[PDB]
Design a protein around this ligand. Sequence first.
Ligand SMILES: CC(=O)N[C@H]1[C@@H](O[C@H]2[C@@H](O)[C@@H](CO)O[C@H](O)[C@@H]2O[C@@H]2O[C@@H](C)[C@@H](O)[C@@H](O)[C@@H]2O)O[C@H](CO)[C@H](O)[C@@H]1O
Ligand SMILES: CC(=O)N[C@H]1[C@@H](O[C@H]2[C@@H](O)[C@@H](CO)O[C@H](O)[C@@H]2O[C@@H]2O[C@@H](C)[C@@H](O)[C@@H](O)[C@@H]2O)O[C@H](CO)[C@H](O)[C@@H]1O
Lengths: 332, 332
Amino acid sequence: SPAGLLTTPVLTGAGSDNRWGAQIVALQPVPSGFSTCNRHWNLNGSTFGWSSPRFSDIDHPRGNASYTGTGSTNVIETWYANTGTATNNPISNIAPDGFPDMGAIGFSGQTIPTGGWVGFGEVWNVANGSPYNGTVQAYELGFATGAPNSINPATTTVGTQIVAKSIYGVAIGQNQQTAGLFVLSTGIVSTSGPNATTYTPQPNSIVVAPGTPAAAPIGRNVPVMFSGVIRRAGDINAGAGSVNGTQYGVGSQPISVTLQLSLTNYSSSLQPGQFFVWQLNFASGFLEIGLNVDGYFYIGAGASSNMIELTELIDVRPVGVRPNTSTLVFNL
Amino acid sequence: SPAGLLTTPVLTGAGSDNRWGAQIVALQPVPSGFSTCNRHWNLNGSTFGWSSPRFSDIDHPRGNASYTGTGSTNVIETWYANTGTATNNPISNIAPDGFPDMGAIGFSGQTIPTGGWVGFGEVWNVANGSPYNGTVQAYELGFATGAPNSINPATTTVGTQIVAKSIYGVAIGQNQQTAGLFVLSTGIVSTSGPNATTYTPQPNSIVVAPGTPAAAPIGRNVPVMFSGVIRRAGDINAGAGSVNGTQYGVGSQPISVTLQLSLTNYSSSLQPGQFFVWQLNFASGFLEIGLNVDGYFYIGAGASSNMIELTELIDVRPVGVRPNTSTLVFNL
Ligand SMILES: CC(=O)N[C@H]1[C@@H](O[C@H]2[C@@H](O)[C@@H](CO)O[C@H](O)[C@@H]2O[C@@H]2O[C@@H](C)[C@@H](O)[C@@H](O)[C@@H]2O)O[C@H](CO)[C@H](O)[C@@H]1O
Ligand SMILES: CC(=O)N[C@H]1[C@@H](O[C@H]2[C@@H](O)[C@@H](CO)O[C@H](O)[C@@H]2O[C@@H]2O[C@@H](C)[C@@H](O)[C@@H](O)[C@@H]2O)O[C@H](CO)[C@H](O)[C@@H]1O
């Protein structure tokens, strides 16, 4: 039975999203719909992504590393490779396990891009595994075309590149026709200055692989993401309730759900056209949330994209299987 | 009932340890005993440490930052503060949530220490939260005395310092009366060259707070840690089965156990002098594992310190409450 996929602790503070690993504190309705495949599982035990249902560090053994200009100190370092070259990843060769499903936003000069996935890492020597220790930095990672020096974000894994580009200067740049990449899988969002940006990634920034089904709205039932507070590069100390604004990151599933779906096949429990529904009971009201066979969650928010805070959530109660065309109750 | 605290997926690939967050693939017996408090919960809903049962980041808002060298570029950066000053941490002011419970080993000149906890991060500007973006590096973090100029590791939180020192040079050093620290909570171990070191941390390197109970041997029943493969700085690409040797990190609990123990109290199901016992069934043989009220796990390995691989583990089955003086069966 799918009832055990969503329980009270997942949404009252013990849950974490499947993209950022952040503590789930809100639901984010998406009236346009969206797609996600990386670290996302369906109810047929399957993913279209390239990541396991845990937070693996990111390691690719064969890319091109460079910096611009003749000076080698305090320089922007860029690493890139084609998609489909993560030949050591057993899930998919699209990209390394853990590599973020977001477009790599271009930047040059002194500018820092807004809204990219940033991780801390370094380039390493393919002869022996040793780091090029002057290349440690915060790197924006994502999918792109035009690397190395005309980067534009991409939304597809087909015929594109994976890129890491340092958002700040490294101590000692490396020009290596072949070099490895190592980045931790805990991300922050790129920002400049003190302001928070929109919830990240926005729908049109998510990269998906061929075959990924979309989460489309069905009437007033719209797909939802799970939101937590994430760090941002421009005000690294900002957290929940910062006077400079609170930054949210979203994922398509709680990671505990992803993990359960990767270990058990639910195809006999739910079939296309149905949701499994739970009731979320708050201090003053309730709403229903539905899960479809593609692993996406839905709520009946209609055209609203206002975040639903979970602070006053009391409990989650299973309701059962219902048609996906029946409007999910929204009584907040 | 504690039975649900250990299930088959925790030990067959879906579990992670509570210090490194690494996939659990082995058990490490500790015949001489050990103590752990950080990110360790007991069966009375309580921790003696300073971290939540999750991994995000380490943030301290008030330390001293400095560097050494004839210039300010490609220099070693040190940050320190006293224990007991993390007053924004609701669990404990001992240290920031996520700060590693390991001693900081001193180093100078070219060489770096073997066996320290290393994380990626930076120091930041307390006036506005912005990073000192030239201070990004891999930093050894731990507890110490003698910071900044004569760092030596400590194993107590009483009267000591928390320190971060970059293992490689930063792009632009900072000498600041006050600076913040930001480091990601998933660490690697410090090494030089290709070799792995001993499992990390060894018992004599673990930092505990006053009141932390020890895990002592009881007859042939000895405490055990949970081991997974971790990265090491000297060969950052090495993983499981590297030709250069495999590096293990240990934690006192699977993080799923820590999380469950933090959400519900088990004091009525187990009392001092008792274990809750499970049987681990392998393709050839079995062993029993026990959990005590202080949250430590035990096996009947007697004097043996050999790691036990979980490759051939088939399943975990609960046995029930037993006296801790009864020898746990070990049939491998
Ligand atoms: C107009 C408004 O929104 N007032 C709120 C708000 O005020 C904050 C906010 O504007 C942030 C933006 O970065 O900057 C300050 O923190 C500001 O605080 C208010 O103004 C300053 C100049 C001081 O007078 C301060 O005491 C005052 O609170 O947020 C605050 C709470 O954080 C209040 O809710 C205001 O009504
Ligand atoms: C003496 C011994 O135990 N040899 C093993 C070992 O050999 C490896 C190992 O020594 C690593 C250490 O970093 O370096 C090489 O990979 C070495 O490989 C062996 O020797 C080289 C010179 C080549 O001849 C190579 O083909 C050969 O395998 O590990 C390997 C498995 O990786 C074997 O198990 C050896 O018997």
